[PDB]
Structures are given as structure tokens and as C-alpha cells.
From a paper:
Type IIB receptor protein tyrosine phosphatases are cell surface transmembrane proteins that engage in cell adhesion via their extracellular domains (ECDs) and cell signaling via their cytoplasmic phosphatase domains. The four human R2B RPTPs (PTPRK, PTPRM, PTPRT, and PTPRU) are type 1 transmembrane proteins and share a common extracellular domain (ECD) architecture of one MAM (meprin/A5/μ), one immunoglobulin (Ig)-like, and four fibronectin (FN) type-III domains, with the most membrane proximal FN domain undergoing furin cleavage in the secretory pathway. Previous studies have shown that PTPRK, PTPRM, and PTPRT form homodimers, but not heterodimers, in cell aggregation assays. The homophilic (trans) interactions of R2B RPTPs determine their subcellular localization and have been proposed to function as spacer clamps between cell membranes.
Numbering used by the authors: 481 to 724
Amino acid sequence: LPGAVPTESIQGSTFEEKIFLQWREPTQTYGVITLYEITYKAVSSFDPEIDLSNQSGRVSKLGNETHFLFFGLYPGTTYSFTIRASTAKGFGPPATNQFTTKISAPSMPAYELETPLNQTDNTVTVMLKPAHSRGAPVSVYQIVVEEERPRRTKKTTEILKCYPVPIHFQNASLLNSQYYFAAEFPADSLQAAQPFTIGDNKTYNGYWNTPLLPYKSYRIYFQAASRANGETKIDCVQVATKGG
Ligand SMILES: *[C@@H]1O[C@H](CO[C@@H]2O[C@@H](C)[C@@H](O)[C@@H](O)[C@@H]2O)[C@@H](O[C@@H]2O[C@H](CO)[C@@H](O[C@@H]3O[C@H](CO)[C@@H](O)[C@H](O)[C@@H]3O)[C@H](O)[C@H]2NC(C)=O)[C@H](O)[C@H]1NC(C)=O
């Protein structure tokens, strides 16, 4: 029977849903290694919403090549790996270490550009719903109001992307940004579906929520962010349009 893999050789390069785990063979060969058997057990997570008991599993990595790409993992989560080496006559002792998947952006609610709850010359009111954590808690919500320039083509030069750079309304004209952040909430607001009024003129976390100009065409996105380990990740979804 073979020795164990040296615990200190086990290293992992980690992603949102994958961990590439890598090690070195046991210190001296009793006999040829035929497979490594690996258990991964979900240890802990920054996500408040998932039950980890079902997230564990086993890998019988056939063959004696010393790495494996773990797949389908859950983000923001620490997995403990136990590696056993096997001579054809049986396993060596286990060695074990743990690594953590990186967090991912929260998953927004589904929107279909339903006609808003009410609309005026200066305001639009829409029903917001809480986003779900996927790897880390939702930290803040942000609301993006974006002006439409006149266009002569549908086509885009590049992929559609969200808004990581916040901008207060009063600075957009100076900075020539196409959008402004109308509001930000701590995510303890919007724990259940409740309407929100674009342009209600009140200030949320330092963002003024400027009323809209009726001769301007606008589209509004609802965005959410999650934070851990200095990585902070966002997603956004368009909730309404206005023109006049
Ligand atoms: C990892 O595995 C390789 C592959 O060996 C093959 O796969 C194993 C999982 C077992 O099923 C083995 O029974 C099987 O041979 C080992 O490397 C080298 O593989 C070659 C090809 O099979 C072996 O070749 C033979 O060796 C004999 C003796 O020298 C010659 O007379 C033959 O002509 C033939 O070429 C070779 O033995 C094998 N090398 C060694 C040192 O065993 C590899 O060693 C193994 N490593 C570990 C750490 O497990």
C-alpha cells in the first residue's frame, strides 16, 4: 500500500463554480498508483441561502496523474478535499486541505418590461423585487437611469455590460456620462416586493434621484452587488423605459 500525498503539496486554483486541484505524488513508491480517490465536503459559505449538506461528493480519479478539475461547485464556498492514493492493493492514508470558490454576482429577479405601475411627465414607478444571493450576501442595490442618444443602427460594437462605476446626477453633465445612479439601498431594504418611484426627488444613500425630463427618452436598470475578500460583483436588469 502507498503512502499519502504530502498534505502541503495540495494546492487549488479556484473559480466561481470550479476548483482546479493539484498535488504531487506520494513521497516514495511502494507500488504503482492506479487512482486517487477524493472526497470534497462543503465546509462553509458566505451565501446565507444554501443548505450545504447536499453539496458534498466523491471523486475516484482513475489514473495516477496528480490533478483534478472540480466542477459544478457552488460559489463563495469553502470545500475541504481529502485525497487518498491507491496502489492496486489498496489505499494509502488520506491527506486533506481546503479551498474556497470565488463569489459570483447576485441573480436578479426576472423582468419583462411590463408597463410600469404609474408614469407621469417626471416620474416612473416600478415594482422592485429582491435579488437572490449566489455565493455572498447582497450588499447594496443601485438604480441606473440612462439617457438614449439617437441611433441609426440596432447593432452594437460590443457586449452589453452593467454599471460598476457609480455617478451622482449632478456630476453626469460635467463628466459626460450616459447614465446616473438615482438611488442606492442597503440590502435590508427591499426584502420583499415593493414599488419604487424613479424621480421622487428624495435622496437615497447620497444619490439624489433626480426627477426625469419629459422631453428625454430614458431606460432604467435595477442592479445589485455582492462583496467579499476585496472582490465585489454586480449584475443589472432593465425594468422600464420612458419617452416623451
Ligand atoms: C503511473 O502510471 C504509469 C503508467 O504505467 C501503467 O499505468 C499504471 C496505472 C499501471 O496500470 C501500470 O501497471 C501500467 O504499466 C507508470 O509509468 C510507466 O508505464 C509504462 C507503460 O505501462 C511501464 O512500462 C513497462 O515497464 C517495464 C519495466 O521497466 C518494461 O519492461 C516494459 O517494456 C514496459 O515499457 C512502466 O513500468 C511504468 N514505469 C514505472 C516506473 O513503473 C508510472 O510509473 C506510474 N507512476 C506512479 C507514481 O504511479
